Amino acid sequence: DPEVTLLLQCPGGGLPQEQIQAELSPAHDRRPLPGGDEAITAIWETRLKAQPWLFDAPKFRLHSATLAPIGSRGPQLLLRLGLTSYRDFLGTNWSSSAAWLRQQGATDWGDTQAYLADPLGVGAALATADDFLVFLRRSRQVAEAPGLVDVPGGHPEPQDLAGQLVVHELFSSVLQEICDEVNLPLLTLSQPLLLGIARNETSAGRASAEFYVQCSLTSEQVRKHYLSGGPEAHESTGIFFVETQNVRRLPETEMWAELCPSAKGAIILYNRVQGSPTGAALGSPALLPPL
Ligand SMILES: Cc1ccc(OCC(=O)N2CCOCC2)c(C)c1
Known about the structure:
By secondary structure, the protein is an alpha+beta fold. It is built from eight helices and eleven strands. The protein binds 2-(2,4-dimethylphenoxy)-1-morpholin-4-yl-ethanone (S07). Residues 147-159 are annotated as: Disordered. This is Uridine diphosphate glucose pyrophosphatase NUDT22.
C-alpha cells in the first residue's frame, strides 16, 4: 500500500480527548511558495470562473504529532497545528505540480510538506452493537476517489489554552460527521478514541486523524437510520457492513483495491490498535486463529 503511510500509532488501545494537547501557532503554517502565492490565486480564479457557487473555508493544518514516552503519566500526545484553507489545498496538494512542490520543500526547508496546505481530515472505524464496521460507497460523479469505498468522516473547522478548545473541536467533528452522513442520533455514539494519523501519498501527503467510535445500535438499525434520510440526506450512494472478525484479513480481499487511501488508513490503525491482542486470553489460538 504505497498510497498510505502511518505517521502515528496511539498506545493503550487509543487515546481519549483528555490525554491530548494541541499547539495552534502560525509557526506551523505552510511557507509562502517560491515564486509567490500568486500561483494559488490564479488556480482559484480559473476554478471560480467555471463554478462561481464554490467558496473558500478555513481548515486546520497538521505540522507534526509527538507521542510521550510509553507508559508515562500526564498528557500523551502533542499535536502541532497551523491554519490553511480549501483554496490553498486546491493550489498545492491538488495542483498538477504537487510533486515539484514536495522536492522544492526538501531542498529549501528540509521538509517535503513545507509548501503544501496539508489540511487535517478526520475519519472513524465505526463499530455496531452486533460487531460490524460501517462502510460508505462514494458517488462515481465526484472529483476525489470517485466510486471508491470510504468510512465516515469530514473536516474539523476553525470557525494548551486555545489548545484544549481545538482538541474538543477535533473529537466533536468526527461525531458530527457520523450524525450528518449516517443519520444516527448523537446519544447512540461513544466518546471517540484517537487510533493514530495516516497520510494519503496520492494527495501529496495530506493527513487524517483516525478514531474508533462504538454505536449502541445493531447493523440493521444503522442501515434503517441511513436509508430513512432519503437520497438527499447523504453524499454517499450506499452503506454496507463487514464483521470485525473479517476486517482482520481485509487487505487480502478484493474490497481492498476499492478502498480510498484515508479509509485504508482507518482500517490498518483499527487492526493494529483495537485488534492485535497482547494478553494470554484473547491471544489463545481458538480466539486468535493462526494465518
Ligand atoms: C480532500 C479534501 C476534500 C475537501 C476539502 O474541503 C472541502 C471544502 O472545504 N469545501 C468548501 C465548501 O464547498 C465544498 C468544498 C478539503 C480541505 C480536502
